Write an enzyme that holds these catalytic residues in place. Structure first.
Site, PDB file in Angstrom:
ATOM      1  N   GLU A  42       0.849  -1.212   0.000  1.00 36.50           N
ATOM      2  CA  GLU A  42       0.000   0.000   0.000  1.00 36.50           C
ATOM      3  C   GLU A  42       0.874   1.249   0.000  1.00 36.50           C
ATOM      4  OE1 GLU A  42      -2.909  -0.102  -1.425  1.00 36.50           O
ATOM      5  OE2 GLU A  42      -3.660  -1.397   0.331  1.00 36.50           O
ATOM      6  N   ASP A  45       2.932   2.078  -5.066  1.00 40.56           N
ATOM      7  CA  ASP A  45       2.941   2.049  -6.553  1.00 40.56           C
ATOM      8  C   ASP A  45       3.591   3.348  -7.056  1.00 40.56           C
ATOM      9  OD1 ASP A  45       0.502   3.506  -6.118  1.00 40.56           O
ATOM     10  OD2 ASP A  45      -0.618   2.392  -7.587  1.00 40.56           O
ATOM     11  N   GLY A 137     -13.348   1.971  -2.178  1.00 39.46           N
ATOM     12  CA  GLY A 137     -11.925   1.590  -2.040  1.00 39.46           C
ATOM     13  C   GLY A 137     -11.494   0.387  -2.885  1.00 39.46           C
ATOM     14  N   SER A 140     -13.507   1.500  -8.253  1.00 36.56           N
ATOM     15  CA  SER A 140     -14.631   1.649  -9.204  1.00 36.56           C
ATOM     16  C   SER A 140     -14.130   2.457 -10.407  1.00 36.56           C
ATOM     17  CB  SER A 140     -15.853   2.258  -8.549  1.00 36.56           C
ATOM     18  OG  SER A 140     -15.517   3.407  -7.791  1.00 36.56           O
ATOM     19  N   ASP A 185      -4.084   0.257  -9.933  1.00 34.88           N
ATOM     20  CA  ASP A 185      -5.530  -0.088 -10.010  1.00 34.88           C
ATOM     21  C   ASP A 185      -5.857  -0.332 -11.470  1.00 34.88           C
ATOM     22  OD1 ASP A 185      -5.269   0.386  -7.251  1.00 34.88           O
ATOM     23  OD2 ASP A 185      -6.641   2.160  -7.321  1.00 34.88           O
ATOM     24  N   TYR A 235      -4.084  12.223   0.143  1.00 40.43           N
ATOM     25  CA  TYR A 235      -3.415  11.317  -0.827  1.00 40.43           C
ATOM     26  C   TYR A 235      -2.329  12.091  -1.579  1.00 40.43           C
ATOM     27  CZ  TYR A 235      -2.597   7.916  -4.532  1.00 40.43           C
ATOM     28  OH  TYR A 235      -2.003   7.092  -5.456  1.00 40.43           O
TER      29      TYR A 235
HETATM   30  O1  LIG Z   1     -17.387  11.019  -5.631  1.00 43.34           O
HETATM   31  C1  LIG Z   1     -16.426  10.275  -5.659  1.00 43.34           C
HETATM   32  C2  LIG Z   1     -15.222  10.521  -4.753  1.00 43.34           C
HETATM   33  C3  LIG Z   1     -13.943   9.920  -5.345  1.00 43.34           C
HETATM   34  C4  LIG Z   1     -14.133   8.424  -5.597  1.00 43.34           C
HETATM   35  C5  LIG Z   1     -15.164   8.282  -6.708  1.00 43.34           C
HETATM   36  C6  LIG Z   1     -16.419   9.111  -6.623  1.00 43.34           C
HETATM   37  C7  LIG Z   1     -17.632   8.876  -7.548  1.00 43.34           C
HETATM   38  C8  LIG Z   1     -17.729   9.791  -8.818  1.00 43.34           C
HETATM   39  C9  LIG Z   1     -19.027   9.799  -9.650  1.00 43.34           C
HETATM   40  C10 LIG Z   1     -20.302   9.614  -8.845  1.00 43.34           C
HETATM   41  C11 LIG Z   1     -20.175   8.456  -7.842  1.00 43.34           C
HETATM   42  C12 LIG Z   1     -19.006   8.626  -6.873  1.00 43.34           C
HETATM   43  N1  LIG Z   1     -17.387   7.719  -8.469  1.00 43.34           N
HETATM   44  C13 LIG Z   1     -16.173   6.892  -8.433  1.00 43.34           C
HETATM   45  N2  LIG Z   1     -15.978   5.749  -9.290  1.00 43.34           N
HETATM   46  C14 LIG Z   1     -16.997   5.309 -10.199  1.00 43.34           C
HETATM   47  N3  LIG Z   1     -16.997   4.087 -10.792  1.00 43.34           N
HETATM   48  C15 LIG Z   1     -18.093   3.957 -11.599  1.00 43.34           C
HETATM   49  C16 LIG Z   1     -18.563   2.886 -12.437  1.00 43.34           C
HETATM   50  C17 LIG Z   1     -19.782   3.055 -13.154  1.00 43.34           C
HETATM   51  C18 LIG Z   1     -20.524   4.251 -13.055  1.00 43.34           C
HETATM   52  C19 LIG Z   1     -20.058   5.284 -12.224  1.00 43.34           C
HETATM   53  C20 LIG Z   1     -18.822   5.147 -11.478  1.00 43.34           C
HETATM   54  O2  LIG Z   1     -18.110   5.999 -10.590  1.00 43.34           O
HETATM   55  N4  LIG Z   1     -15.094   7.199  -7.575  1.00 43.34           N
HETATM   56  O1  LIG Z   2      -2.401   1.234  -1.909  1.00 44.77           O
HETATM   57  C1  LIG Z   2      -2.492   2.671  -2.244  1.00 44.77           C
HETATM   58  C2  LIG Z   2      -3.260   2.960  -3.553  1.00 44.77           C
HETATM   59  O2  LIG Z   2      -4.292   3.960  -3.390  1.00 44.77           O
HETATM   60  C3  LIG Z   2      -5.122   3.664  -4.546  1.00 44.77           C
HETATM   61  O3  LIG Z   2      -6.442   3.842  -4.260  1.00 44.77           O
HETATM   62  C4  LIG Z   2      -4.609   4.420  -5.733  1.00 44.77           C
HETATM   63  O4  LIG Z   2      -5.508   4.448  -6.839  1.00 44.77           O
HETATM   64  C5  LIG Z   2      -3.380   3.517  -6.046  1.00 44.77           C
HETATM   65  O5  LIG Z   2      -2.701   4.013  -7.203  1.00 44.77           O
HETATM   66  C6  LIG Z   2      -2.475   3.409  -4.815  1.00 44.77           C
HETATM   67  O6  LIG Z   2      -1.811   4.665  -4.651  1.00 44.77           O
END
Ligand SMILES: O=C1CCCC2=C1C1(CCCCC1)N=C(Nc1nc3ccccc3o1)N2
Ligand SMILES: OC[C@H]1O[C@@H](O)[C@H](O)[C@@H](O)[C@H]1O
Length: 391
Positions: A42, A45, A137, A140, A185, A235
């Site tokens: 962790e 990377d 986490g 997505s 990721d 981060y």
């Molecule tokens: O608000 C944050 C804070 C940072 C982390 C992060 C989000 C949101 C951004 C858009 C609205 C939902 C939450 N989405 C994701 N990943 C994601 N994966 C997806 C796969 C299919 C459709 C939609 C997807 O959104 N990560």
């Molecule tokens: O294990 C720590 C990790 O945090 C992730 O969520 C990020 O997308 C990775 O690139 C790495 O930095």
């Protein structure tokens, strides 16, 4: 009744139905790319270090068809997605480029299209679905970047390498989602293989597929169902800190710096700075041991090096949170658990428990009865990375 089953056949079926309803015809292509659990390694990377993730049966599916009119039309069905559920935009050109904005889920698809290296890229219609818990986490955003990228390859095959595709996905995360992530990721979403962890060397970009066969061993992922403010904010701070312990020690990355070096370098850097390295320069030099330990099937040791990873994430890297600490320290007292730790970026999201399958029903009783918050569980097989199905 806290265990969410993957249900991937019904995720594809949901996406095809929504496509026929939305666009008036059958989609021509399906792609998927998984989310990920990092077993160990962790905040290594971006320090050109080593990580040991695997792909989940939790995934993002695009279902779509090329268009003739040079424009992109998207429907998302994911409950968590921010409004609107649909966006349309022309393909970028020399004149006009795509811009991040609203809604945010679209930024991921825009970024990948914007940085896509092959041509000519046609417009397309697509439905986006995911079983990866949004912001929980398990990456997505990487599944959606890599699922996008895998769809673009069918529209206009690239002639490049798995690392070039990961950098493109990574650049969309930087430019369009303002998240300065490492390569882990994207890489695991691309390259995961059923029944394998992926040891990644983020200096050389060499990768090894480490069999995770043994059906004795289970990986329990538990969502805390928290995300603290500090996440999105700290981060880049941690990243920047690492870059100074490296600059101060005349090392081009912390990969190069070893623990014997940092200990005799205390004076050249700060107490919290030096502590960021005891974690990183340390962390690297125990994913290696965890790697060498999974091969030997040893388990205990991955475990020790694992709980040593959490303790180091909690005290030295300061990127755990009381919820993660209570989940890890909770599981870590149940006999047959080798280790439990925060996984991914921290400040919330999931832990990862390396337990014996026989005890899975009692752990999910126990954690849900002994966790202050709401637990969701995944009992995760190690899974395939990006895939195509012609429809
Ligand atoms: O608000 C944050 C804070 C940072 C982390 C992060 C989000 C949101 C951004 C858009 C609205 C939902 C939450 N989405 C994701 N990943 C994601 N994966 C997806 C796969 C299919 C459709 C939609 C997807 O959104 N990560
Ligand atoms: O294990 C720590 C990790 O945090 C992730 O969520 C990020 O997308 C990775 O690139 C790495 O930095």
């Amino acid at each position: 009744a806290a265990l969410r089953q993957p249900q991937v056949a019904e995720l594809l079926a949901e996406a095809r139905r929504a496509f026929r309803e939305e666009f008036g015809a059958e989609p021509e292509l399906a792609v998927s790319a998984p989310g990920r659990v990092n077993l160990i390694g962790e905040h290594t990377d971006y320090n050109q270090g080593l990580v040991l993730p695997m792909a989940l049966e939790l995934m993002t599916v695009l279902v779509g068809s090329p268009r003739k009119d040079g424009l992109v039309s998207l429907l998302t069905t994911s409950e968590g997605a921010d409004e609107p559920q649909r966006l349309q935009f022309p393909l970028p050109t020399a004149q006009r480029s795509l811009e991040p904005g609203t809604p945010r889920w679209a930024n991921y698809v825009k970024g990948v299209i914007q940085y896509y290296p092959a041509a000519p890229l046609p417009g397309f219609s697509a439905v986006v679905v995911s079983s990866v818990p949004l912001g929980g986490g398990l990456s997505s955003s990487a599944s959606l970047e890599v699922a996008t990228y895998t769809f673009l390859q069918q529209l206009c095959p690239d002639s490049g390498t798995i690392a070039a595709r990961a950098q493109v996905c990574q650049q969309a995360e930087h430019s369009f989602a303002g998240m300065p992530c490492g390569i882990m990721d994207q890489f695991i979403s691309l390259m995961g293989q059923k029944g394998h962890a992926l040891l990644i060397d983020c200096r050389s970009l060499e990768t090894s597929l480490v069999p995770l066969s043994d059906p004795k061993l289970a990986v329990l992922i538990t969502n805390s169902n928290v995300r603290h403010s500090l996440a999105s904010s700290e981060y880049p701070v941690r990243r920047r800190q690492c870059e100074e312990v490296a600059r101060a020690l005349g090392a081009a990355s912390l990969r190069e710096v070893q623990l014997e070096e940092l200990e005799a370098a205390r004076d050249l850097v700060s107490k919290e700075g030096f502590r960021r390295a005891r974690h990183v320069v340390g962390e690297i030099r125990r994913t290696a041991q965890a790697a060498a330990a999974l091969r030997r099937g040893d388990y205990r040791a991955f475990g020790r090096l694992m709980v040593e990873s959490h303790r180091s994430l909690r005290d030295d890297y300061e990127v755990s949170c009381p919820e993660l600490d209570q989940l890890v320290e909770a599981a870590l007292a149940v006999p047959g658990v080798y280790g439990s730790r925060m996984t991914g970026g921290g400040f919330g999201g999931c832990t990862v428990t390396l337990l014996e399958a026989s005890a899975a029903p009692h752990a999910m009783r126990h954690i849900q009865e002994h966790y202050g918050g709401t637990a969701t569980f995944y009992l995760s097989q190690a899974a395939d990375g990006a895939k195509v199905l012609c429809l």
